[model samples]
Target chain A: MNISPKAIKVRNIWIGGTEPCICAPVVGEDDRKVLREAEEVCRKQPDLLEWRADFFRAIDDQERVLATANGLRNIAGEIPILFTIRSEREGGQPIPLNEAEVRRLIEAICRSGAIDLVDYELAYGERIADVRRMTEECSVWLVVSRHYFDGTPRKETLLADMRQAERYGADIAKVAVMPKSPEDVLVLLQATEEARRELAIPLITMAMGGLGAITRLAGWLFGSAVTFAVGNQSSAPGQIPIDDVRTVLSILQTYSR
Target chain B: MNISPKAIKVRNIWIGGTEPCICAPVVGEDDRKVLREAEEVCRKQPDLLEWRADFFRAIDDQERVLATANGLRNIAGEIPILFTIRSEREGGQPIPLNEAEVRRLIEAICRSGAIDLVDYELAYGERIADVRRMTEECSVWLVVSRHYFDGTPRKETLLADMRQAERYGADIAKVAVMPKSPEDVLVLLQATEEARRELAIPLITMAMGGLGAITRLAGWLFGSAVTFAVGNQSSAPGQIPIDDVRTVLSILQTYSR
Candidate 1:
């Protein structure tokens, strides 16, 4: 992986170049369904787009996935696209490929130049380094993601995830944990603070579940550069609509300035 | 004031009782015209109600304020009422009450038995202990509130406020601060955690403005016993609608077991 810390900007929306860019999630089946969804997302004008590839039936056909990526890219125009093939364990689809095969598919997709950003789950263990290398090699910005399916972990777990992703050469390190209690959300926010002040890379941290849904709108306040909003189908368990996220971000940014 | 550490349970509600109850800022003359508004809030089932007396046009008339409190309690049935003369300096109705006059009015209202809870600003300095005693004499719950009109304070400032309220023999310590940045909101949540664990009595802590709206629904998760929500209207900035707060709290409480 490129360990030089060379700042790579994602499309025109720059974070390493400026502040964190706002990203919204797009999920659906088939190119036709998702492509139309992309149009609505484009109108919403999110900084980056995520092709929640879990719902696509043709996920096995690398070509079909690439085609869908291409459709999204064109619709996205100048906005960068973040393509993620979330595994079932990470709260995603029951895809045809195993972890190893999925890594290869993602590598191929990144190399295909269909999207600007590729999200590789840090939970894939040793496979994360390989994905990192592939993304770095293809000049694609790697979004290293850590998803806590249950509620928010102890502070130690959150800090460890942030460190692990940074070590894996992630351009942006991300962690999404569920907050069973309000104090649990505090742990997530505290971790975000620790990373923002300690680490060099940009971060994205939020707690999921109905209790933590507000974390989406408030993530940027916690040093998150990019936040995920629901564009079409819900990609994660708790996601605000894209329009709602945009409105919130605007309010936060405006009020702060 | 009882020093018994027994919180007066407000009937069927999950929290607030002999313990200090919280009152939302429902200021403005419109709410006064619709006297039924106070009755409606009582019906919604709060342990105590507040008139945001500073916003009332007839705040100068001590008799009218006392009558209103009695009427509110009558409509509330068993629910008690709190008389809050929020100074403009402390994020309340802009009725032109200076700090000295506000303190005196609070004393007068307490004497009339119209207030079960008294909202006094922690920043009121020398008056803090005086107001504490007034509420104490009436056997009223003392809500020592710290408001940051400009923005949320640094973590240390928040902690100091907590300690100050405790020092003044406050039955309940309340803090509402505006978030200037995303990190500021985290500071409020962090402070809440610290206060909940450290305080001898319970606490009500919230971050105000749009970014802090989630703090209301999620406060319990953070250990905030009494959260402010809208009555017929929002008395303060950054308040969520009562229905929304109720829905979110229901969603948050479901997974607790």
Candidate 2:
């Protein structure tokens, strides 16, 4: 059964509902290079832009973060932006910040009003409550994410994590897991279906790696509302090119209706 | 459960068992043009080659057909060749022949030993019995095919069709259906799984169209033994390019083991 996710609007873009929104990431170490990457990604015209702030060298400097955020906005214009400071533990670049400092950085970025959505890792546990509150205060959509770099866990654990994201007041719940086998990919798809029906928030779930590449294209059938695709560079493993993603998505759209 | 089919050797090429064999088609109207197309497809080194004889203008001419088949063998060398005379009723070119003539043409082709496999459409009814017997006598592997040009049928109907092919002593039982929805594709996959476990012969099934294109790559996980791809031309709807199919299949093979 194909259950439509609860529709959520970020700026003029719809993240859920009928179609899966294609999100491309900007990964650069420097402000100038990052902005140029964002410009190139924006020219590709992805449905949403994700700034992997962990890739930025000056991420700890709030002024530089704000400047880069503004630069991304200038290039992207009306495109919805998803700001993510992925922790080193969660398949992201290392940042020299404590838990409290990381929380503060996320809060500051939300308050800057330069980005539309903020990704709060569920691994933060009780630490995410304050960040969730900050996003609410800033009127920005919160994307509570969980990444499993090792191997896909049980379907029950995945479902529970997604529900936890919704309980934390997230507009979108994202989960990515590395699949060791084809069965692992099936587990992720099953979990996505279960979470989409049970959770109030829209679901963004994918199985990473070569064995799970089909999930990126067929995930929407299992109730994933957003898919991460590559523009200039890939932020994650098994990320398909934007044009190929668009082509497959267009075919899905034609038959899905 | 991922059920493995019984591996059958067609000359040097193996179909079924652990890996899904990629079969590309040659669809040229002229004998010279068709052989050239076969040579081009052979250069890609697909696992199997399918000759859609209905597309050939001189298909009724036994001498030309034999000459073209010999020419294809010279180019293809050890690659397994599958001869198919698609009926007009099943999204193929009109052959303007009665059932007896069709059976005689297939028998002559099989006797010529120009092809390794012969596709006998299940729609041929009792007329196909002699052809099947002739293939068995000539040691040519029989692929009894059932094509649904409209929407995909019920899972029970698909399973029954596959079992019937097996009952008719087919080396392979192939089924292809046009998917109206993703659920319809799911039905085809489920049917493939059920047939794989239930039947003794190898099963080849696919959900046609863009919505079901993932089956071409991911179908092996669900127990499909063979996948048809395109080389210079597509013999059917939703046939992916051989290069793309090979790339995806290579990835699946690497991870599946």
Candidate 3:
């Protein structure tokens, strides 16, 4: 079977398809705060919800994590939720869980079937294989991601990174890098178009920081499937408020075609 | 005095300043047609005006051309006007004037002292030297420009092209290219940003066509100093209506900072 890397339906919306999807990030410290954050972004009506679990204080506690995920699912209603636990090395905040603890937490969440999608860094090689099995059994989508905080890599490096994620069995492959100059952002978008053409799976790419903000607004023109916008707080760089993102994206979309 | 290339003051507007400028093109075949076109765009209040001389049916008739130019100046009132006579090789319509006749016509308009700026293609080599003298003596700003109707050039080639225009004593350097792929548009923007940083003189660069429309909207972020919008008709590619351009540019300008 050629799986052929195509757009997958997630709840009410589909990724890697005709229209670009907007994903808002919600970050809160506890279940109540998380629920509060989820309620706020849900009001904005994002196509999908991203719960950046690394921000939760009780991330290592499986019961608490599941409880928050359940609350998030309820508040989000039909909006699909994407659970992300970014590691410290990848420009994420410090968390209490170790690699093994994080793996079990991921397994526990996968078993519960609360999230429509789950994200794990491609650098953690063995765990993705382990997590892939759980996702495969539960029918949850897997997003393999890479982040470059210092600056954007060369075009070849950016292309290689996304390809590696796909080879790791990613349902969606993503690359986010900070731009040192305006040209770097263009190169990132260029590489994105290249990957979107060559890869069967949907791909996401962005250049972070003030200079790269245009990429966040117009990256979809070059084949980025989903764009992140701030809800409660920004989990990544170069994101504006979700409302603003919707407005800009709507206008650009009109003239883009 | 080592003339460090910097922004030039054109009427009330400054070309290479902290804020980008919007120029509207007015293309009409006759004096009354040109005036009507000028009147329509003037109400929208473009930062500058561009008179595509090749679009005028009487372009070879010196008296008619100057008369139409005077009417445009009157209608523009305070807005500065840019005069252009695009050549056939550079994607312009066929005109009656040959090299010598066109040269004499340029001198006639420049010495008339009715226009604020004049545009001559850089490819005309020794020809621009004579045009420059006329522009210089008449206190008119000269824009030495290059256009690629087929596709964009390599990064190094783009940089060298702009540098040559500057070396030839251009008050402003401009490049307009068509993009073959999404990546080609990216390279054009990337080259625009590079030229903006390296050159002190204000520069203009845009990738034309539907796929490259975002460049018309957000090219300023990457150092493109001026963008064109439609008035009566479009002399170039990828220009939105002036009214729509104002709204979209206002929204983009708000978030650009």
Which pairs of residues have clashing backbones in candidate 2?
A: none
Question: Chain A in model 3: its TM-score?
Answer: 0.96
lDDT of 2 at A18: 66
Per-residue C-alpha lDDT of model 3 across residues B196-231, encoded as one tens digit per residue:
878878788888887678888778777778889876
Superposition error at B188 for model 3 (Å):
1.0
Report the number of the highest-DockQ candidate.
Answer: 3
Per-residue lDDT of A28 in model 1 = 76
Q: Give candidate 1's whole-model lDDT.
A: 0.71
Between candidates 1 and 3, the lDDT winner: 3
Predicted candidate 2 versus true structure: per-residue lDDT over A159-253, tens digit per residue: 99999998888888999999986667777887887777788788999998776777887788778888898999999998888887776666545
Checking candidate 3 for backbone clashes, the offending pairs are A5-A200
Per-residue lDDT tens digits of candidate 1, residues A1-257?
11112335666566643344567777878989899988987788677788888888988898888888887878888988888888788788798878878887888888888888788888777877778877878999888888888677888888888889989888888899987766787788778867776778888787887666656765555566766776665677677677666655554444333
In candidate 2, what are the lDDT values of residues B102-138, reduced to their tens digit?
A: 7788888888888999998987767667887889888
Q: Once model 1 is optimally superposed onto the true structure by TM-score, how far is the C-alpha of residue A198 displaced, in angstroms?
A: 1.6
Report residue A18 deviation for candidate 3 (angstroms). 2.2
TM-score, candidate 3, is 0.94
Error (Å) of candidate 2 at residue B239 is 5.6
